[PDB]
Ligand binder design. Sequence first.
Ligand SMILES: NC(=O)c1ccc[n+]([C@@H]2O[C@H](COP(=O)([O-])OP(=O)(O)OC[C@H]3O[C@@H](n4cnc5c(N)ncnc54)[C@H](OP(=O)(O)O)[C@@H]3O)[C@@H](O)[C@H]2O)c1
Ligand SMILES: COc1ccc2c(c1)c(CC(=O)O)cn2C(=O)c1ccc(Cl)cc1
Ligand SMILES: COc1ccc2c(c1)c(CC(=O)O)cn2C(=O)c1ccc(Cl)cc1
Length: 315
Amino acid sequence: QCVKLNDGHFMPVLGFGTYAPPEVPRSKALEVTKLAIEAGFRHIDSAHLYNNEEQVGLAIRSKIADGSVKREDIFYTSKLWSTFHRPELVRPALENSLKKAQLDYVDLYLIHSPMSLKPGEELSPTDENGKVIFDIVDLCTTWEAMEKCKDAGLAKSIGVSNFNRRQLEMILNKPGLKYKPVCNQVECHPYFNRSKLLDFCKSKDIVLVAYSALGSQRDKRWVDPNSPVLLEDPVLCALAKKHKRTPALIALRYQLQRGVVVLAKSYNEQRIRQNVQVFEFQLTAEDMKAIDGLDRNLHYFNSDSFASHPNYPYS
Ligand SMILES: NC(=O)c1ccc[n+]([C@@H]2O[C@H](COP(=O)([O-])OP(=O)(O)OC[C@H]3O[C@@H](n4cnc5c(N)ncnc54)[C@H](OP(=O)(O)O)[C@@H]3O)[C@@H](O)[C@H]2O)c1
Ligand SMILES: COc1ccc2c(c1)c(CC(=O)O)cn2C(=O)c1ccc(Cl)cc1
Ligand SMILES: COc1ccc2c(c1)c(CC(=O)O)cn2C(=O)c1ccc(Cl)cc1
């Protein structure tokens, strides 16, 4: 149940999302990642940003030691945070993630976001007016350093996240490009299905990886309070009744059948185990077109301040 990436490696089409807000104890990450592996998840999505690589790395270590899986069975993703876009900072950032997770390599390393921020120790650098400080970096130089990370053996594959078509093309058209990004991890769900970006990605043999595929965690820091709740969508719910599944399963299956690799975050054992059932049923072609009609250009991640970033992807 994997897709072949354009560098020859394989990515499981269903991945476990690991981000949880700060109110969630860090020990939970450890617990639930073990449950996910136990439930059958093999693709695990983390990031320096998430303050959990240590716990996720431990879960993997633990499941390897008890014989449940081997390292080669696990597909582990980390991401370069935006304060580390300057080329000389890329490898050290990766090495730090590897040290935290106690891993020798990541299966996939991504540029988390094209919106570069001031280099430093703060994840969100702010000036004396409390305004977040942008940085200007040629992402092609960042990519060059990512390429060196793949050659250094520290990342089996490299890709990007939250890039738009133009931004993807800047990398694809870079003089002397060695490695195309294997994927672009972007917000993708029935209310923002990214069909045009998906088509482009396919034409370039780049995998689109969907996040907030279940409608996001509706975190107060970036959600629109008035935005509809994805999993309460009448069409999704009617399809769930028809197939005797759940709205979540319909949403995940939607992505699988359109050739999208899909992430699913849950810190709940039963929902974690429910989510792997996505391989148990099929949506009809008519089902798929019906879901396609739900698109409303709705992103669950909003930021007025970042909307003014020169590399804001949604402009
Ligand atoms: N590259 C990026 O910038 C970026 C951005 C966002 C996310 N991501 C990645 O993608 C992952 C998932 O995206 P997401 O964090 O926005 O959350 P999500 O996958 O859209 O899931 C959102 C919520 O769905 C609930 N849920 C899960 N399974 C369910 C089920 N079977 N039935 C009903 N509800 C269910 C979970 O609550 P419970 O925990 O209570 O089950 C979760 O909080 C993240 O964890 C992260 O790894 C990356
Ligand atoms: C403090 O916690 C944070 C801070 C920033 C975050 C996130 C979480 C996430 C969720 C995750 O990756 O799971 C995305 N972020 C982004 O910057 C982002 C960048 C570009 C776009 Cl278009 C959307 C989100
Ligand atoms: C504590 O460290 C961080 C780092 C990055 C953060 C944040 C917090 C927040 C929450 C807040 O600032 O209130 C948003 N961020 C983003 O970059 C962001 C950019 C674009 C979008 Cl669409 C969403 C989030």
